[PDB]
Design an enzyme around this catalytic site. Structure first.
Site, PDB file in Angstrom:
ATOM      1  N   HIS A  83      14.578 -17.071 -12.035  1.00  0.00           N
ATOM      2  CA  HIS A  83      14.406 -16.080 -10.980  1.00  0.00           C
ATOM      3  C   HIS A  83      13.545 -16.570  -9.826  1.00  0.00           C
ATOM      4  CE1 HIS A  83      15.915 -13.322 -14.098  1.00  0.00           C
ATOM      5  NE2 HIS A  83      15.025 -13.890 -14.893  1.00  0.00           N
ATOM      6  N   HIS A 142       4.272 -18.629  -7.220  1.00  0.00           N
ATOM      7  CA  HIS A 142       5.722 -18.754  -7.075  1.00  0.00           C
ATOM      8  C   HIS A 142       6.111 -18.204  -5.713  1.00  0.00           C
ATOM      9  CE1 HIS A 142       5.046 -14.694  -8.595  1.00  0.00           C
ATOM     10  NE2 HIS A 142       6.014 -14.382  -7.749  1.00  0.00           N
ATOM     11  N   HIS A 154       9.296 -16.022  -3.246  1.00  0.00           N
ATOM     12  CA  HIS A 154      10.510 -15.258  -3.013  1.00  0.00           C
ATOM     13  C   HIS A 154      11.040 -15.658  -1.641  1.00  0.00           C
ATOM     14  CE1 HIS A 154       9.503 -12.659  -6.438  1.00  0.00           C
ATOM     15  NE2 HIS A 154       8.253 -12.856  -6.044  1.00  0.00           N
ATOM     16  N   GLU A 210       9.128  -9.963   0.168  1.00  0.00           N
ATOM     17  CA  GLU A 210       9.203  -8.707  -0.565  1.00  0.00           C
ATOM     18  C   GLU A 210       8.451  -7.605   0.169  1.00  0.00           C
ATOM     19  OE1 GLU A 210       8.183  -9.861  -4.755  1.00  0.00           O
ATOM     20  OE2 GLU A 210      10.367  -9.654  -4.959  1.00  0.00           O
ATOM     21  N   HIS A 243       3.335 -15.754  -3.799  1.00  0.00           N
ATOM     22  CA  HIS A 243       2.517 -14.934  -4.687  1.00  0.00           C
ATOM     23  C   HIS A 243       1.655 -15.832  -5.558  1.00  0.00           C
ATOM     24  CE1 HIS A 243       5.648 -11.455  -4.337  1.00  0.00           C
ATOM     25  NE2 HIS A 243       4.797 -11.471  -3.329  1.00  0.00           N
ATOM     26  N   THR A 272       6.633  -7.264  -9.138  1.00  0.00           N
ATOM     27  CA  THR A 272       7.883  -7.030  -8.429  1.00  0.00           C
ATOM     28  C   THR A 272       9.086  -7.534  -9.202  1.00  0.00           C
ATOM     29  OG1 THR A 272       7.847  -9.103  -7.202  1.00  0.00           O
ATOM     30  CG2 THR A 272       6.666  -7.222  -6.266  1.00  0.00           C
TER      31      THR A 272
HETATM   32  C1  LIG Z   1      12.105 -10.578 -17.901  1.00  0.00           C
HETATM   33  C2  LIG Z   1      11.061  -9.630 -18.483  1.00  0.00           C
HETATM   34  O1  LIG Z   1      11.331  -8.492 -18.715  1.00  0.00           O
HETATM   35  O2  LIG Z   1       9.779 -10.168 -18.727  1.00  0.00           O
HETATM   36  C3  LIG Z   1       9.708 -11.565 -18.465  1.00  0.00           C
HETATM   37  C4  LIG Z   1       8.435 -11.990 -18.906  1.00  0.00           C
HETATM   38  O3  LIG Z   1       7.381 -11.251 -18.082  1.00  0.00           O
HETATM   39  C5  LIG Z   1       6.080 -11.807 -18.379  1.00  0.00           C
HETATM   40  S1  LIG Z   1       4.997 -10.925 -17.244  1.00  0.00           S
HETATM   41  O4  LIG Z   1       5.207  -9.355 -17.645  1.00  0.00           O
HETATM   42  O5  LIG Z   1       3.461 -11.509 -17.415  1.00  0.00           O
HETATM   43  N1  LIG Z   1       5.603 -11.237 -15.651  1.00  0.00           N
HETATM   44  C6  LIG Z   1       5.271 -12.649 -15.352  1.00  0.00           C
HETATM   45  C7  LIG Z   1       4.047 -12.655 -14.396  1.00  0.00           C
HETATM   46  C8  LIG Z   1       4.298 -11.649 -13.233  1.00  0.00           C
HETATM   47  C9  LIG Z   1       3.488 -12.066 -11.992  1.00  0.00           C
HETATM   48  C10 LIG Z   1       3.556 -10.994 -10.878  1.00  0.00           C
HETATM   49  O6  LIG Z   1       4.770 -11.236 -10.195  1.00  0.00           O
HETATM   50  S2  LIG Z   1       4.830 -10.763  -8.602  1.00  0.00           S
HETATM   51  N2  LIG Z   1       6.408 -11.151  -8.099  1.00  0.00           N
HETATM   52  O7  LIG Z   1       4.682  -9.175  -8.842  1.00  0.00           O
HETATM   53  O8  LIG Z   1       3.819 -11.739  -8.180  1.00  0.00           O
HETATM   54  C11 LIG Z   1       5.686 -11.347 -19.739  1.00  0.00           C
HETATM   55  O9  LIG Z   1       4.612 -12.201 -20.265  1.00  0.00           O
HETATM   56  C12 LIG Z   1       3.446 -11.481 -20.605  1.00  0.00           C
HETATM   57  C13 LIG Z   1       2.124 -12.262 -20.692  1.00  0.00           C
HETATM   58  O10 LIG Z   1       3.494 -10.311 -20.828  1.00  0.00           O
HETATM   59  C14 LIG Z   1       6.785 -11.119 -20.703  1.00  0.00           C
HETATM   60  O11 LIG Z   1       6.314 -11.266 -22.126  1.00  0.00           O
HETATM   61  C15 LIG Z   1       6.157 -12.399 -22.970  1.00  0.00           C
HETATM   62  C16 LIG Z   1       5.829 -12.060 -24.440  1.00  0.00           C
HETATM   63  O12 LIG Z   1       6.247 -13.534 -22.631  1.00  0.00           O
HETATM   64  C17 LIG Z   1       8.214 -11.492 -20.361  1.00  0.00           C
HETATM   65  O13 LIG Z   1       8.853 -12.418 -21.253  1.00  0.00           O
HETATM   66  C18 LIG Z   1       9.924 -11.825 -21.953  1.00  0.00           C
HETATM   67  C19 LIG Z   1      10.918 -12.716 -22.723  1.00  0.00           C
HETATM   68  O14 LIG Z   1      10.051 -10.640 -21.933  1.00  0.00           O
HETATM   69 ZN   LIG Z   2       6.386 -12.629  -6.842  1.00  0.00          ZN
END
Ligand SMILES: CC(=O)OC[C@H]1O[C@@H](S(=O)(=O)NCCCCCOS(N)(=O)=O)[C@H](OC(C)=O)[C@H](OC(C)=O)[C@@H]1OC(C)=O
Ligand SMILES: [Zn+2]
EC number: 4.2.1.1
Length: 257
Positions: free
Chosen positions: A61, A91, A93, A103, A116, A195
């Site tokens: 993504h 990362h 966008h 975004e 971000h 996001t």
């Molecule tokens: C696809 C989905 O639903 O979740 C995709 C991953 O998400 C990351 S997260 O909740 O920590 N998001 C990654 C960091 C987000 C940074 C903020 O992004 S922004 N674009 O708002 O700067 C999660 O990791 C954590 C620490 O919670 C998820 O959980 C795990 C156990 O790895 C999840 O991985 C999976 C397989 O679900």
């Molecule tokens: Zn982001």
């Protein structure tokens, strides 16, 4: 599952992640005339001198550079924040064209891309716990416009050919994220969410007023990445941005006048 295409994009996400229609979703449009100057906001403290980058990764993504967050090495403090937030990753966008890709928007203006820098609150111990908390994350957002090159971005651009498809990664050590920052740390701030799914409402957003300029050759290199894994049809990682979400019961505060 979820993605950025017609059949799995942002308009579909609420089916698997009902919080997508929640009360503090991101990104938002930043109406500069409605954001209120808050003279009690403190200056941001960006302490990146000891940052330890590890890997660069195509996750299907976006593309991210991950850092060592097992110690207080690169931390964000101050501003609207209480306590210490460790830098986990950054990362981007971006769009298929220069007029879209960010975004957040500013007075409905879209930038070509948005950086971000993702940080998590050390009082919660790990990022998996922080994402379950209203103040678990702080994301520093920086807009990208197309013009002159950003020299500090070039070492990122130059390795993207080695992480073309979903699931590829490379050693990315000794990268200095300070080379991606604009001169000014003036910012807008509101309470928001991730996001991307799971869209958890755990983010204090800090969005910088000043964009950085990147060259057309730099952003073209972003648009050569693929959403797909190798062996799957190729579909260009472009337009991996969620559009602005309703502001609802929130005020955006400005650190500047
Ligand atoms: C696809 C989905 O639903 O979740 C995709 C991953 O998400 C990351 S997260 O909740 O920590 N998001 C990654 C960091 C987000 C940074 C903020 O992004 S922004 N674009 O708002 O700067 C999660 O990791 C954590 C620490 O919670 C998820 O959980 C795990 C156990 O790895 C999840 O991985 C999976 C397989 O679900
Ligand atoms: Zn982001």
């Amino acid at each position: 599952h979820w993605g950025y295409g017609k059949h799995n994009g942002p308009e579909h996400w609420h089916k698997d992640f009902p919080i997508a229609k929640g009360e503090r979703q991101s990104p938002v449009d930043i109406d500069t005339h409605t954001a209120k100057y808050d003279p009690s906001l403190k200056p941001l403290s960006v302490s990146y001198d000891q940052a330890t980058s590890l890997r660069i990764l195509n996750n299907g993504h976006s593309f991210q550079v991950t850092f060592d967050d097992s110690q207080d090495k690169a931390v964000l403090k101050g501003g609207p924040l209480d306590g210490t937030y460790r830098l986990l990753q950054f990362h981007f966008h971006w769009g298929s064209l220069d007029g879209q890709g960010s975004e957040h928007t500013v007075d409905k203006k879209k930038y070509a891309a948005e950086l971000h820098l993702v940080h998590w609150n050390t009082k919660y111990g790990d990022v998996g716990k922080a994402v379950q908390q209203p103040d678990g994350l702080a994301v520093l957002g920086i807009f990208l416009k197309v013009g002159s090159a950003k020299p500090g971005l070039q070492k990122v651009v130059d390795v993207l050919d080695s992480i073309k498809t979903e699931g590829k990664s490379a050693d990315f050590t000794n990268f200095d994220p300070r080379g991606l920052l604009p001169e000014s740390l003036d910012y807008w701030t509101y309470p928001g969410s991730l996001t991307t799914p799971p869209l958890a409402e755990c983010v204090t957003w800090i969005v910088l007023k000043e964009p950085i300029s990147v060259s057309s050759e730099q952003v073209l290199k972003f648009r050569k990445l693929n959403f797909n894994g190798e062996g799957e049809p190729e579909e260009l990682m472009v337009d991996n941005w969620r559009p602005a979400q309703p502001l609802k019961n929130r005020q955006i505060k400005a650190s500047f006048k």
